[PDB]
């Protein structure tokens, strides 16, 4: 239940410079739980398939909605929208 | 939209062992006016009600049929022109493998 | 591939309009041969023995 959880621990990763941009945001959300479960039960996670497209776009929009919320609450700060 | 559609099916009252000619012009109407009715692929299914059971039977229409049925005005049992070589019997089978579903009409019903 | 790429927001609904794009251009050609298939459809309505015989009674 991580994609509802997940602001604290990007935030945090992102002031250990563990995630420095959004790619390393999805990079950093392929080493969990919830990447090994989105291909094996899709439909949990409001995914529509297990292929590269669908899950790189839904971690992706996962990353950019919880970076825009991070970025909103004015705790990081993205210039180049990347 | 993500199905095509296959034809209709509907009851008779007994069986008969042909096609209807009130079905191939109802068919063949269905088909004249609607271009998204091929004629290769709709069938007309009939479940006749024979005795303690139903028999069912699937009907093509033939470019033949097709043409009559688009052209037919007489509503009657025996019209002008009526050959069996309007339809061709189709293979149509049974499934336990797959469920199929209904669509009903949404303001009222179906009867 | 393995690793997915992050696509920004503007780039995944391009690829979204793309896509549309695609299968409303399939649906219009399948459409299209709907239609040459129905035209189709509607205006085709408008001595060896014997010795094969030698062998079978051999």
């Not at chain 1, 292929?51 to 909605?65: A, F």
């Amino acid at each position: 239940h991580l994609d509802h959880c997940m602001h604290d621990h990007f935030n945090a990763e992102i002031v250990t410079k563990t995630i420095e941009n959004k790619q390393d945001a999805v990079d950093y959300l392929t080493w969990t739980f919830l990447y090994r479960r989105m291909t094996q039960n899709p439909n949990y996670y409001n995914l529509q398939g297990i292929s590269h497209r669908h899950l790189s776009d839904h971690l992706s929009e996962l990353v950019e909605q919880t970076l825009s919320d991070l970025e909103q609450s004015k705790c990081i700060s993205i210039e180049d929208e990347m | 939209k993500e199905m095509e559609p296959l034809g209709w099916i509907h009851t008779q009252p007994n069986e008969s062992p042909q096609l209807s000619p009130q079905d191939v012009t109802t068919h063949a109407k269905i088909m004249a006016d609607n271009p998204s009715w091929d004629g290769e692929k709709t069938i007309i299914i009939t479940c006749s009600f024979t005795p303690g059971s139903c028999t069912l039977t699937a009907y093509k229409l033939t470019p033949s049929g097709y043409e009559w049925g688009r052209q037919n005005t007489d509503k009657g049992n025996n019209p002008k022109g009526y050959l069996p070589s309007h339809y061709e019997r189709v293979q149509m089978l049974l499934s336990d493998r797959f469920l199929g579903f209904f669509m009903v009409p949404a303001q009222s019903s179906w009867n | 591939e393995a690793k997915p790429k992050f696509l920004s927001k503007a780039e995944r609904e391009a690829e979204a309009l793309k896509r549309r794009q695609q299968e409303v251009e399939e649906r219009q050609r399948m459409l299209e041969e709907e239609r040459k298939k129905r035209k189709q459809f509607q205006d085709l309505g408008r001595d060896k023995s014997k010795e094969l015989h030698a062998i079978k009674e051999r």
